[PDB]
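User: I'm putting together a small comparison set for a docking exercise, and I want a reference complex before I start. The sequence is below, and the ligand is biliverdine IX alpha. Could you produce the 3D structure with the ligand included, as C-alpha cells?
Assistant: Of course. I'll restate your input first, then give the C-alpha cells for the complex.
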Amino acid sequence: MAVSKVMEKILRVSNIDKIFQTTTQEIRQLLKCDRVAVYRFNPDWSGEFVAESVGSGWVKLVGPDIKTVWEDTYLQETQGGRYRHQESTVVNDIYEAGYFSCHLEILEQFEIKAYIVVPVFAAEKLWGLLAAYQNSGTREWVEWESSFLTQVGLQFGIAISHAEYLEQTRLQSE
Ligand SMILES: */C=C/C1=C(C)C(=O)N/C1=C\C1=NC(=C\c2[nH]c(/C=C3\NC(=O)C(C=C)=C3C)c(C)c2CCC(=O)O)/C(CCC(=O)O)=C1C
C-alpha cells in the first residue's frame, strides 16, 4: 500500500464529504432539529455551507445545483468572532437575541428561529462553524445539546486537519 493511502486509512479520513453528510444527519436526528450544517471560512472570513442535513420542507443550502455563501460583516471584521477563542453561541429565539435587521433578514431567508453554533478548528486555526437550527419554532436549548455539538465540532476539526495534512504532503517522495 502507498504511504499516503496507509495514512489516510489510519487517520480515518477516507472521504470527508461522506463523513460530514452522515454525521450531520445523525446529529439532526439526535437533536430533533430542522437543520444541521457545516460552514467553511474563506481567507477573507466570508464563507460557504459545505454540508448539511435538513428536514422536510425547509430551504436547501447545500446540493449539486446550490451554492450558499454567507459573507457575514461581523465575522469578517472580527476574524471569526468569539469562535476564534473557542466559544459557542446558543440562541433560543433570534428575535430576543438583540440582532440588527440585516442579520435577522439573513436568518429569516434560511428559515432559522433558534440555533446553536460552535467553532470548528483545523490545526490551531478557526476553519469553520458547525450549527444546529430550529426552523419550526423557538427552542430552549439545553447545555448537553450545546456541549455535545461543541464536542462534534472538535471531531470535525480534527478530520479536516487530517485532510489538510494529507493534501499538504504535496509531492514529497515517500
Ligand atoms: C448587517 C450586516 C450583515 C450582513 C449582510 C450579514 O450577513 N451579517 C451581518 C451582520 C452581523 N452578523 C452578526 C453576528 C453573527 N453572524 C453570524 C454568522 C453565522 N451564523 C451561522 O449560523 C453561520 C453559519 C453556520 C454563520 C456564517 C454569527 C454566528 C453571529 C453571532 C451571533 C451571536 O453572537 O449571537 C452581527 C452581530 C449581532 C447583531 O447585532 O446582529 C452583525 C451586525
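The CA atoms of residues 6 and 12 lie 10 Å apart. The chain has one domain: 1-174.
User: Thanks, that's exactly what I needed.
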